[PDB]
Scaffold this motif. Structure first.
Motif, mmCIF file in Angstrom:
data_model
loop_
_atom_site.group_PDB
_atom_site.id
_atom_site.type_symbol
_atom_site.label_atom_id
_atom_site.label_comp_id
_atom_site.label_asym_id
_atom_site.label_seq_id
_atom_site.Cartn_x
_atom_site.Cartn_y
_atom_site.Cartn_z
ATOM 1 N N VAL A 14 16.936 62.816 -17.356
ATOM 2 C CA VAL A 14 16.580 64.214 -17.176
ATOM 3 C C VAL A 14 17.251 65.044 -18.257
ATOM 4 C CG1 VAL A 14 16.182 66.008 -15.440
ATOM 5 C CG2 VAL A 14 16.673 63.703 -14.723
ATOM 6 N N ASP A 15 16.450 65.887 -18.906
ATOM 7 C CA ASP A 15 16.916 66.721 -19.967
ATOM 8 C C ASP A 15 16.769 68.189 -19.628
ATOM 9 O OD1 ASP A 15 17.407 64.319 -21.099
ATOM 10 O OD2 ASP A 15 15.549 64.267 -22.271
ATOM 11 N N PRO A 16 17.891 68.922 -19.468
ATOM 12 C CA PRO A 16 19.296 68.514 -19.563
ATOM 13 C C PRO A 16 19.666 67.823 -18.264
ATOM 14 C CG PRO A 16 18.988 70.699 -20.417
ATOM 15 C CD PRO A 16 17.767 70.363 -19.620
ATOM 16 N N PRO A 17 20.873 67.221 -18.205
ATOM 17 C CA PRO A 17 21.291 66.539 -16.971
ATOM 18 C C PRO A 17 21.997 67.482 -16.020
ATOM 19 C CG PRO A 17 22.844 66.115 -18.689
ATOM 20 C CD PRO A 17 21.642 66.731 -19.351
ATOM 21 N N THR A 18 21.925 68.768 -16.359
ATOM 22 C CA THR A 18 22.535 69.829 -15.578
ATOM 23 C C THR A 18 21.736 71.083 -15.845
ATOM 24 O OG1 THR A 18 24.794 68.918 -15.945
ATOM 25 C CG2 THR A 18 24.629 71.143 -15.135
ATOM 26 N N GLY A 19 21.841 72.026 -14.922
ATOM 27 C CA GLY A 19 21.190 73.313 -15.040
ATOM 28 C C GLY A 19 22.308 74.310 -14.767
ATOM 29 N N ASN A 20 22.601 75.145 -15.749
ATOM 30 C CA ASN A 20 23.644 76.150 -15.605
ATOM 31 C C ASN A 20 23.008 77.552 -15.567
ATOM 32 O OD1 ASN A 20 26.520 74.504 -16.396
ATOM 33 N ND2 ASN A 20 24.586 73.602 -17.188
ATOM 34 N N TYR A 21 23.211 78.262 -14.453
ATOM 35 C CA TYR A 21 22.619 79.583 -14.213
ATOM 36 C C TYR A 21 23.569 80.739 -13.902
ATOM 37 C CZ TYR A 21 19.360 75.907 -12.948
ATOM 38 O OH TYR A 21 18.596 74.759 -12.876
ATOM 39 N N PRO A 22 23.037 81.961 -13.927
ATOM 40 C CA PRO A 22 23.812 83.158 -13.634
ATOM 41 C C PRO A 22 23.624 83.379 -12.164
ATOM 42 C CG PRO A 22 22.408 83.477 -15.462
ATOM 43 C CD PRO A 22 21.883 82.310 -14.753
ATOM 44 N N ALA A 23 24.728 83.473 -11.442
ATOM 45 C CA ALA A 23 24.675 83.643 -10.005
ATOM 46 C C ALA A 23 23.524 84.497 -9.502
ATOM 47 C CB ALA A 23 25.973 84.166 -9.487
ATOM 48 N N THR A 24 23.339 85.676 -10.087
ATOM 49 C CA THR A 24 22.287 86.572 -9.622
ATOM 50 C C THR A 24 20.869 86.147 -9.866
ATOM 51 O OG1 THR A 24 22.285 87.940 -11.612
ATOM 52 C CG2 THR A 24 23.714 88.589 -9.768
ATOM 53 N N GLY A 25 20.670 85.148 -10.704
ATOM 54 C CA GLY A 25 19.313 84.714 -10.950
ATOM 55 C C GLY A 25 19.210 83.951 -12.239
ATOM 56 N N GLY A 26 18.382 82.910 -12.239
ATOM 57 C CA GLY A 26 18.229 82.093 -13.428
ATOM 58 C C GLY A 26 17.014 81.193 -13.488
ATOM 59 N N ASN A 27 17.015 80.316 -14.485
ATOM 60 C CA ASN A 27 15.902 79.434 -14.699
ATOM 61 C C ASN A 27 16.213 78.420 -15.769
ATOM 62 O OD1 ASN A 27 13.355 78.555 -14.470
ATOM 63 N ND2 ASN A 27 12.438 80.324 -15.499
ATOM 64 N N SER A 28 15.546 77.273 -15.674
ATOM 65 C CA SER A 28 15.679 76.173 -16.640
ATOM 66 C C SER A 28 14.583 75.121 -16.448
ATOM 67 C CB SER A 28 17.034 75.489 -16.503
ATOM 68 O OG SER A 28 17.092 74.789 -15.274
ATOM 69 N N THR A 29 14.062 74.579 -17.545
ATOM 70 C CA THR A 29 13.006 73.562 -17.478
ATOM 71 C C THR A 29 13.663 72.220 -17.801
ATOM 72 O OG1 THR A 29 11.374 75.151 -18.488
ATOM 73 C CG2 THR A 29 10.666 72.881 -18.203
ATOM 74 N N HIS A 30 13.192 71.151 -17.157
ATOM 75 C CA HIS A 30 13.740 69.826 -17.419
ATOM 76 C C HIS A 30 12.667 68.806 -17.770
ATOM 77 C CE1 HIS A 30 17.784 71.036 -15.763
ATOM 78 N NE2 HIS A 30 16.986 71.953 -15.249
ATOM 79 N N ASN A 31 13.034 67.860 -18.612
ATOM 80 C CA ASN A 31 12.127 66.826 -19.053
ATOM 81 C C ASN A 31 12.505 65.518 -18.363
ATOM 82 O OD1 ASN A 31 10.476 65.083 -20.503
ATOM 83 N ND2 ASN A 31 11.343 65.574 -22.540
ATOM 84 N N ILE A 32 11.635 64.978 -17.517
ATOM 85 C CA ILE A 32 11.943 63.692 -16.888
ATOM 86 C C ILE A 32 11.192 62.669 -17.734
ATOM 87 C CG2 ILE A 32 11.815 62.282 -14.791
ATOM 88 C CD1 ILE A 32 11.682 64.846 -13.198
#
Length: 109
Positions: A6-24
């Motif tokens: 999984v890319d990335p192997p982590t998702g780091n977000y801002p407490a109030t709201g966030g987003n990130s896409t991952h490649n399996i």
């Protein structure tokens, strides 16, 4: 080993709201079915839950951080090998056929 990354192997977000896409991405010459177990179905909205990843292919994962407290949570992706023939991504899981799992960390701070 594994057979999925999984890319990335982590998702780091801002407490109030966030987003990130991952490649399996696949590493088997066989097709895979994946199941996504979420720890916090209330600050996080992950998509899809089930799904295929063609042989030596790629499939995307959509995790969406919503307003909430700054804490850490996780997503466990289980996989299984499947014949081209398999329709439902849920069949090898309703079957108890998980062959491995990757843990995506979800740190909201």
């Amino acid at each position: 080993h594994s057979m999925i990354n999984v890319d990335p192997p982590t998702g780091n977000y801002p407490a109030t709201g966030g987003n990130s896409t991952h490649n399996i991405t696949s590493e088997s010459d066989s097709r895979l079915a994946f199941k996504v177990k979420s720890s916090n179905n209330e600050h996080y909205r992950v998509r899809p839950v089930y799904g295929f990843v063609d042989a030596k292919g790629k499939s995307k994962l959509d995790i969406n951080r919503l307003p909430g407290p700054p804490k850490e949570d996780k997503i466990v992706i289980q996989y299984a090998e499947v014949p081209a023939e398999e329709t439902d991504p849920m069949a090898p899981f309703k079957a108890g056929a998980q062959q491995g799992e990757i843990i995506v960390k979800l740190i909201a701070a």
